[PDB]
Write a protein that binds this ligand. Structure first.
Ligand code: 23X
Lengths: 99, 99
């Protein structure tokens, strides 16, 4: 699809057996999901945003389908106000910026 | 151009006659640049994301050339981690997300 940027580029994603709305975010190196109780091992991480840093749980090799396109990779989970699909997954679904 | 996402989508901008490197950030509502001088009146504003809010200076109707494309719009200036081109200007330059 083509997504214009008049509004937030929110799309439906499928992860760990939930459908979620998530921002396709070219400014995000990593994918950051709102708090959710994913199974499996994780590693602690701190990521820096506009207001400072938050602590997140890093889960590896998590399947995520982004409206139709399958990806698998690292997902960070923590107290973000929005689900963020970052470049690690955007590259996998062949997402580009175009102008 | 078409810009892939295996690297940060950093582009050269020209603003107030100065060249800077800024991140094309579809997850950002607004454009916020690191502390710098810009001509004209500004008003205090606060903007937020992960880690909470920061105080910025809002400059309206500021010309910025982004990767050779002209925009004129709101530029926020403050303690952002990186120079960010947000949707307010990405829309002006005709930027879309495609996959
Ligand atoms: C490169 C620095 C950048 C800040 C990283 N983040 C991604 C960014 O697009 C966020 C997304 C966002 C939107 C709304 C609420 C909260 C966040 N936008 C924002 O924080 C913007 N907020 C809004 C409301 O658009 C602000 C810029 C104000 C306009 S980020 O979200 O802080 C982020 C994401 C992934 C990641 N991986 C490693 S460090 C890292 C940091």
């Amino acid at each position: 699809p083509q997504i214009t940027l008049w509004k937030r580029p929110l799309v439906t994603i499928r992860i760990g057996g939930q459908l979620k709305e998530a921002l396709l975010d070219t400014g995000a190196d990593d994918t950051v999901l709102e708090e959710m109780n994913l199974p499996g091992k994780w590693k602690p991480k701190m990521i820096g945003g506009i207001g400072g840093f938050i602590k997140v749980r890093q889960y590896d090799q998590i399947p995520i389908e982004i409206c139709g396109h399958k990806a698998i990779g690292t997902v960070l989970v923590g107290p973000t106000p929005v689900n963020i699909i970052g470049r690690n997954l955007l590259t996998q679904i062949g997402c580009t910026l175009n102008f």
